Amino acid sequence: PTAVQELNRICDGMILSSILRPQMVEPSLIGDVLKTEPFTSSLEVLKDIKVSGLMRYIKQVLLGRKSYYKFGEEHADGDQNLFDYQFTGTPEEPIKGYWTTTISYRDSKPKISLTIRQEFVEGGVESQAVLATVVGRPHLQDFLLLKRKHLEYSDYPESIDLIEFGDVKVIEKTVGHGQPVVLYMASLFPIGLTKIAEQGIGCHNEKNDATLKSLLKTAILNMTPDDVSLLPRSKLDAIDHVVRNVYLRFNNSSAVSYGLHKLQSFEKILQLNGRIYETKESTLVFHHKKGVLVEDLKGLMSYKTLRVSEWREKQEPEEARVEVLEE
Amino acid sequence: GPTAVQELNRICDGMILSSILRPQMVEPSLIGDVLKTEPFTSSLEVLKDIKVSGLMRYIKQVLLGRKSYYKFGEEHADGDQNLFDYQFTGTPEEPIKGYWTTTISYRDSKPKISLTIRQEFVEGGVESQAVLATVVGRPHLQDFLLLKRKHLEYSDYPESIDLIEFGDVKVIEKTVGHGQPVVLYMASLFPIGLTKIAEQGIGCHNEKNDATLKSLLKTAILNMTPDDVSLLPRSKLDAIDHVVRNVYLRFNNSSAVSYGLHKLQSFEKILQLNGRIYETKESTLVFHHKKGVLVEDLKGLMSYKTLRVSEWREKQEPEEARVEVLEE
Ligand SMILES: [Cl-]
């Protein structure tokens, strides 16, 4: 592998060790991971690799950092003249009548962004804007700059220009003040705070992908329903972060045979975190009465207004009865 | 009245709309005829400083007196190879239809020189497909290695991107035009002397242009006989496909059916040549010549090119009232 791959593997090893074992993010954790995932490139090449998050913390420890990771040390205003564009559908090609665009300041952490969700409804456009930002920012001034970038990048700027700051929902994140953090279930728990900071789960290679799936199930299998009832909300939310990332990796059949949803203690997770999970293929509902359900516009059941039907594994005698149509 | 750009927008809308019934060479008389019903309010002095591209610029230039017709390739620009544009649809934490895709390109390049990396979760991790959209004669490998470093630096150096070798990349080389005049027909440019087309943004997002587009399409197909359709070049059929698909994305399933384009002889001959599966605003329909109108349905007892479908039916309340509300 390369230095990039090695850095990835060390980061995967920490994420993976956090599934069963909370650990303080400090140099000896990286030292202990290095036993299984050594770093064999030279420190000089490491300096050319520009990273953030735990990747960058690992990089710094390999370069000699001895201090523990401090919550909020990555805070960046960003470049207020460089912008990232995220889009979900377009005006030319909406997704089920919707298109969403998020423009953000490049390299801001927490990210400062204006998201505008839009929809064609008789006989105009309905817009919803959310400014996700940080306490103390100049919210009206950030909205206007970002709105201007929305007008310049939009294939339909007429619908944007009428959105006023009074219509915007604001969400403010706070920067940490250097608290040390515990890594557990791919999430940072800053000492003294009650919230968590979910971390990205890599595990893009064969071994780490399979071990991620197996450790999640092992984590849940080793909790009784009463254990789960005793978990604080912050730990429930971190578990939710790993659970949802794992289900995104499965199609419907693989998610079902994975069988996490069959564990008695996972049913307690479902009651506390929700029953609705996105897979690679679609949306499933792990229902306690009806079993596995699959989102289905033509379904004859509704779970919290989502129409669903019973999910069914493909069976060769049934597939053989499907009428294959002439083209 | 509307600003100088909203004016251009409406004039461009008007050209696209005029291209539905007949092909139109892109030349000043086309613009002038559009100005009869969509007149340009603002002063030409404002218009001098607006930054536009594509057809909206050619409209601008014609407003400023240009007598020459539009020339294919006249917009070529190698772009700024020190400055980069960054967009993405989907992320590893919220994939869109199972994928996430990132595109990084050279600022102001036309054709756009870009590296797109699309990824999905598969067994054993992540699969990637990379596409370098570029121009004949570029240094493809150097562009790739430059844009790949950007991707790594933009994505927090995921191991899956670093694994992508130049030999894994699909290279799509666009041709630059050579000054050919161009015909606009069904929202697509046909450069004379070339066999390819360039689909254009269709626009028409206001209420009146939406309805006009829908009306003009049905009329354009009505104006054709089945024999007419069987004589059209593949170029013209692809342009028609462009407009048909944009229109069905504007309907829910019920409105798509009462729109009734699918019921026309000449459209059935179109279906035979472009396919029967059309995404709508609501789901997906199959306009079948034997079974009738079908609708995507994972429970379907029929499959059309592997899509499971059922027969379409109007929403009724005695099916609705029986929907079982589930315990939370
Ligand atoms: Cl058939």
Numbering used by the authors:
A (entry chain A): 2, 1721 to 2046
B (entry chain B): 1 to 2, 1721 to 2046
What do the study authors state?
The L protein synthesizes two distinct RNA species: (i) the antigenomic and genomic RNA as products of genome replication and (ii) the shorter capped viral mRNAs during transcription. To initiate viral transcription, the L protein presumably uses a process called cap-snatching. It is assumed that the L protein cleaves host cell mRNAs downstream of the 5'-cap structure and uses this short capped RNA as a primer for viral mRNA synthesis. Here we present the crystal structures of the two terminal domains of the CASV L protein: the cap-snatching endonuclease in the N-terminus and the 326 C-terminal residues, which, by analogy to LASV, might play a role in transcription.
Optimization of expressed fragments using bioinformatics, limited proteolysis, and thermal stability assays led to the C-terminal 326 amino acids of the CASV L protein (residues 1721–2046; residue numbering refers to the full-length L protein) with N-terminal His-tag as best candidate for structure determination. After His-tag cleavage, the purified seleno-methionine-labelled protein was successfully crystallized and the structure was solved using the single anomalous dispersion method. The protein (called CASV L-Cterm) crystallized in space group P212121 with two molecules per asymmetric unit and the structure could be refined to a resolution of 2 Å. The protein crystallized as a dimer, which is not fully symmetric. The protein monomer is U-shaped and consists of two separate domains, (i) a mainly α-helical domain (domain 1) composed of residues 1721–1793 and 1894–2046 with a long C-terminal tail and (ii) a domain (domain 2) consisting of a large β-sheet as well as one long and two short α-helices (residues 1794–1894) (blue and green respectively). The second domain is inserted into the sequence of the first one and both domains are connected by two long flexible linkers with barely any additional contacts. Most importantly, the highest degree of similarity was seen between the L-Cterm domain 2 and the PB2 cap-binding domain. Domain 2 of L-Cterm also contains an aromatic residue (Y1872) at the end of the homologous long helix pointing in the same direction as the F404 in PB2.
